[PDB]
Homo-oligomer: A and B are copies of this chain.
Amino acid sequence: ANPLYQKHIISINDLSRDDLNLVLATAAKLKANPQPELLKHKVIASCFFEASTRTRLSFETSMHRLGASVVGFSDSANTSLGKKGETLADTISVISTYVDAIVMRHPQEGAARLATEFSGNVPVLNAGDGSNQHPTQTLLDLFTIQETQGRLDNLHVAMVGDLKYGRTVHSLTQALAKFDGNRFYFIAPDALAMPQYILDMLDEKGIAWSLHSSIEEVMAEVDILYMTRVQKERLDPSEYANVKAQFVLRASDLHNAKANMKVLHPLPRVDEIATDVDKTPHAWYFQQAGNGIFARQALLALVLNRDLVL
């Protein structure tokens, strides 16, 4: 079978460069030639212990594009009998007797990994576990980069915004570091700097990175400008008023951008990207979101089907 057959998808740290390339190749193929009955008769659990409408809709749409059926829940602080009292372990022990795969998002780190220990032969796909991993966001990001740039090596990638608390930028950086010759530009307020353990990881692999006060320092060289949201609720309102200037993007900032350059953003964007960026050929955050469908399709297909008939 294919290397991802019946595998749990929990952490970018567990996926090799070959794994990533395989998901991306599969996503390209399904995008070009859909297989709406591939997962016919499969039932997949969509378990959002933590609510996330955008991610859930994306995932469930991917399930339906392959013909699978879907059951699930999205949880505020409350759903029903067992929870609050019963362990996540018991919840998974039960649900894994119902379904062919579990997609789960949860507020506590490690929740998806724990689920694998109780799901028996049922594969678990992590849709987000606290501030730890979100591997399918990273896969859709990589797919979008590869599709627009034609490669995942020898790129110039700027990351802008809240680099300290963004689990998606951490994961994207780890994933890109599995490839060769990439160079990073980190543009963030000192209070929201990319963490040292990420910098240490890059140093150990001899991967170049530098800090910059504004995106104009490096705009002419950038292939991918990956913007994140500022977790302003962590910040003092005055402080948030003082930072945003160097981390807000407008169409005028793109004047010396390369033709190939794409602006990415996992969304929601509210303040970070002015609406005037939307019309430029560089705006790619909606296309990026649309790519979630193919990356998530590829993952479900690879995990639940032995052989890739294309």
**Residues of chain A at the chain B interface (Cβ within 8 Å):** 36, 41, 43, 45, 51-58, 60-61, 64-65, 67, 69-74, 76-87, 90-91, 93-95, 97-99, 109, 131, 165, 191, 234, 236-238, 267-271, 286-287, 289-290, 293
Contacts and interface: CB of A to CB of B under 8 A. Distances in A.
A80 B54 CA distance: 8
A72 B118 CA distance: 29
A85 B165 contact: no
Contact of A270 (B64, B65, B85): B85
Contacts of A87: 270
A86 B268 contact: yes
Contact of A81 (B93, B165, B268): B268
CB-based closest 5 A-B pairs: A97-B290, A86-B268, A82-B268, A64-B69, A53-B80
In the complex, which of the residues A65, A71, A109, A289 has the most CB atoms of chain B within 10 Å of its own CB atom? A71
A97 B293 contact: yes
Contact of A99 (B61, B94, B109): B61
Nearest to A77: B77
Contacts of A90: 267-270
A60 B53 contact: no
A86 B83 CA distance: 24
Given A131-B238, A270-B86, A43 B61 contact: yes
Contacts of A131: 236-238
A90 B266 CA distance: 12
Contact of A293 (B73, B86, B98, B165): B98
Contact of A287 (B41, B71, B97): B97
A41 B38 CA distance: 12
Nearest to A89: B275
A64 to B, nearest CB: 4
A289 B94 CA distance: 6
A231 to B, nearest CB: 10
A268 B73 contact: no
A195 to B, nearest CB: 9
A69 B43 CA distance: 12
A215 B75 CA distance: 37
A93 B90 CA distance: 38
A121 B80 CA distance: 31
B97 A289 contact: yes
